[PDB]
Amino acid sequence: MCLKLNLLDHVFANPFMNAAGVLCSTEEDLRCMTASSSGALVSKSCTSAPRDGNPEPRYMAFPLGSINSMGLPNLGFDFYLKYASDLHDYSKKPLFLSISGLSVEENVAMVRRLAPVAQEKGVLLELNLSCPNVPGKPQVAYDFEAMRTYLQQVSLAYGLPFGVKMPPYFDIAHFDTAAAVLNEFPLVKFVTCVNSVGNGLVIDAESESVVIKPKQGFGGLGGKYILPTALANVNAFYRRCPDKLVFGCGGVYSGEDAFLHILAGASMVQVGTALQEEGPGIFTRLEDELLEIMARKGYRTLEEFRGRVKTIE
Amino acid sequence: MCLKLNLLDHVFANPFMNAAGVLCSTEEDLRCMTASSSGALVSKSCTSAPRDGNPEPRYMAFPLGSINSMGLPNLGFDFYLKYASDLHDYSKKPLFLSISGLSVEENVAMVRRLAPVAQEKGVLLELNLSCPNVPGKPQVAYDFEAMRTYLQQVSLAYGLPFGVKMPPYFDIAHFDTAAAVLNEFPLVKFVTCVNSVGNGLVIDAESESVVIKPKQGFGGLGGKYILPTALANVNAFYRRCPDKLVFGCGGVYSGEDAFLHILAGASMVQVGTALQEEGPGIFTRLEDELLEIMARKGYRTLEEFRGRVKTIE
Ligand SMILES: Cc1cc2nc3c(=O)[nH]c(=O)nc-3n(C[C@H](O)[C@H](O)[C@H](O)COP(=O)(O)O)c2cc1C
Ligand SMILES: Cc1cc2nc3c(=O)[nH]c(=O)nc-3n(C[C@H](O)[C@H](O)[C@H](O)COP(=O)(O)O)c2cc1C
Ligand SMILES: COc1cccc2ccc(CCc3c(C(=O)O)[nH]c(=O)[nH]c3=O)cc12
Ligand SMILES: COc1cccc2ccc(CCc3c(C(=O)O)[nH]c(=O)[nH]c3=O)cc12
């Protein structure tokens, strides 16, 4: 009894991977994720140039989850491309590379360079649509016209199957509009739901202070706070995008939580906060726990229950 | 050392009140809230006509919060207006009346008839800007043009100070836009942040089923899930609407949670899920807990620390 699966013309030992930004920024981090029991890894979202990121403290965690305003600290696209082209051991697991350029032009420039390495090595593109839009505008995925433009331009520039990382939505009309945008693109083969629940605010009662420095304490939420939001987004897109895969991300701390994401429609399951807090050992625990729940239920495959969440009446 | 506040030309023994929809639908519910130690009460959001609402189960709660798709079950506006006009004992505490018409015209119709009772008896209007709009469009407060229309028409029809109940937002740009529209309306004297985090999806692992019947299990989230989102919204509106009060709602289970709301800017503090789960005894607990935090810190009044959350240098 094993959790291996095939998706996107690649084979995966199991459905687990890190969430972009967690344990993926440096060569050391990518080596560590490659040595783990995860089924796959994704790199830190990158920009054309290297970035320091925001001032610290910029990440904090708590029993219910985490808040972050990292600000895209990363080693720059040239580094992640070199990792993909020369350093990653593809015999170990598949690699996804996440791109988050600060404009459409920057994303086009990066994807034009990724394509031959994708063809040659099989690295997979996850395009982060929480990439910053023009300042004073909402993030790109919350601006449907910008979202359509980015995908038009990337599709043209890249020319190969890719995926998109989405922020959560909270309104059924918005599910309908977003999914319709995505379904205009046939090259968009997976949709990762969700990025962090945007612009939360954690306050410490003892000190009377916010807990992160950037943005007056405001940052994206992850972890237990966001599991029902994550599940809703996974299912909403699973129902609306029948010709795409959905990748679940948000609130996974256990094999039960992974099971819920798969029931909702997830094909891979990404682990952010919990992985940041527990370290890469979490992947063996998650696999064990997911296999235990499967065995108790009599399920011998992921396909037997993916997307099979039951509704009432 | 007291929790008492004087706002909107009323006196409140303490900041706590129910959140609209919890323990406020029937005469029995309103008498129970009136008998409690809460500093105020709000009625169930109402429609012109009495509504059966969405099929059951439509509310469920869990250790980290609740999900609901109630569907505005309510006794109809005439009932709540009679309660305000004839039944409520204003010597016990102030009353807010929440309205949630299904069109701008329905809201106008109700506020025209609430006005004279507001003027004579001092009932306070809370206008719910999550009232559903045209289906397939986003909820009113996620459609800024619709929001502006509603506020123009209700301001003209009512002609008295009122407040609004807002959904949460998740973008810095989005928060600014909400402030920009509300600040067009001088009669909007309070902003209640937040209504339920929309369209989440709770799934029971054992039964592999969603837990509420309407909308294929989708529903609004409250409780521990939503406290950092709530705080963010309170503080974002508190900073952007300096001539308005902000009332906090979301994730309050303890005096410590209330203290964080107040540090973020809240003047009243509303209690939804936790009151649904614990019952009205919660109010004496919250008062005692808030007073204990104030005593440890040497604060004698709420204005000492309201809006005084610290940022990092
Ligand atoms: C420290 C940190 C950095 C992150 N950076 C990125 C990023 O570079 N790209 C991205 O797509 N998402 C980023 N995320 C979002 C996560 O990939 C994930 O979508 C979110 O944390 C929710 O998953 P969780 O509940 O498991 O944390 C980051 C999250 C954290 C906590
Ligand atoms: C059962 C239920 C019914 C609700 N009905 C309404 C309503 O009629 N009008 C409204 O403005 N908010 C309604 N809400 C939202 C709450 O007022 C509150 O904004 C939300 O539950 C978050 O607060 P909490 O975290 O304390 O639950 C309802 C919530 C629940 C749980
Ligand atoms: C300049 O880039 C940013 C400034 C401030 C906030 C940011 C939030 C998100 C992002 C995109 C990268 C990312 C980050 C981040 O690097 O902050 N954190 C997340 O949880 N998700 C993400 O997708 C860039 C930001
Ligand atoms: C017909 O009215 C509705 C149908 C389906 C979902 C709805 C959700 C919210 C509302 C507004 C009333 C309300 C409700 C409600 O009555 O469902 N629940 C909340 O958590 N907040 C609210 O403001 C009406 C709905």
Ligand sitting nearest the alpha carbon of B44 = 2
Q: Is the omega angle on the peptide bond into residue B161 within 30 degrees of 0, that is, cis?
A: no
Instruction: State the ligand closest to the CA atom of A250.
Output: 1
Report the run of H or E that residue B156 belongs to, with start and end: helix B144-158
- Taking a C-beta distance cutoff of 8 angstroms, is the pair A166, A178 a contact? yes
Structure tokens at A264: 């909702």
Report the DSSP beta bridge partners of residue B270: B17, B249
Nearest to A43 by CA among A54, A53, A32: A32
User: Is the distance from CB of A182 to CB of A246 less than 8 angstroms?
Assistant: no
* B170 neighbourhood in chain A, CB within 8 Å: 167-168, 170, 197-199
- Which chain B residues are Cβ-neighbours of A210 within 8 angstroms? 309-312
Place of tokens 């007073």: B291
Query: Given A200, A207, A256, which is nearest B229 (Cβ)?
Result: A200
CA distances from B302 to A280, B235, B242, B255, B307 (A): 45, 16, 18, 13, 10
- Most ligand 3 atoms within 8 A of CB, residue of A42, A67, A70 to mutate: A70
Nearest to B230 by CA among A132, A225, A148: A225
- Tokens 């950092």 belong to which residue? B228
Burial readout B184-219 (b: 16 or more C-beta within 10 A, e: otherwise): ebeebbbbbbbbbbbbbbbbbeeeeebbbbbbbbbb
**Quick one: resolution in A?**
1.5
- Other beta carbons within 10 angstroms of residue B143's beta carbon come to 18
Distance CA B111, CA B157 (A): 6
Tell me: cis bond preceding B164? Omega within 30 of 0 counts. no
Q: For A217-247, give one letter per residue: b (16+ CB within 10 A) or e.
A: bbbbbbbbbbbbbbbbbbbbbbebbeebbbb
In the numeric block, which tokens belong to residue B206?
Answer: 């054992």
Task: For residue B194, say if its preceding peptide bond is cis, omega within 30 degrees of 0.
Answer: yes
Q: Which technique?
A: X-ray
Nearest CA to ligand 2 atom 7: B21
Owner of token pair 């945007």: A198
Which domains occur in chain B, in start order?
1-53+72-196+223-313 (3.20.20.70), 54-71+197-222 (2.30.26.10)
Minimum CA distance residue for ligand 3 atom 1: A71
Query: What is the least distance, in Å, from the CA of B258 to any CA of chain A?
Result: 10
Q: Please give the biggest Cα pair distance in chain B.
A: 55
Separate counts of helices (H) and strands (E) for chain A: 9, 16
Which among B64, B139, B203 is the nearest to A309, CB-wise? B203
Q: Rounded to a whole number, what is the distance in angstroms from the first to the last CA of chain A?
A: 34
Q: How far apart are CA B237 and CA B274, in angstroms?
A: 24
Tell me the residues of chain B between 183 and 222 that have a Cβ less than 8 Å away from chain A.
197-203, 205, 207-210, 212-213, 215-218, 221
Residues from chain B contacting residue A218 (CB–CB below 8 Å): 172, 232, 236
CA dist B195 and B177 (Å) reads 18
Three-state secondary-structure class, residue A267: strand
3-state helix, strand, coil in chain B (%, to 5): 40, 20, 40
Going by C-beta distance under 8 Å and a sequence separation of 6 or more, which residues neighbour residue B168? Answer: A170, B193, B194, B195, B197, B226, B229, B230, B232, B233, B250
Tell the residue nearest (CA) to atom 23 of ligand 2. Answer: B250
Closest by CA position to B54, among listed A175, A228, A229, A312: A312
Beta strand A203-204 with A162-166: parallel, antiparallel or unpaired?
Answer: unpaired
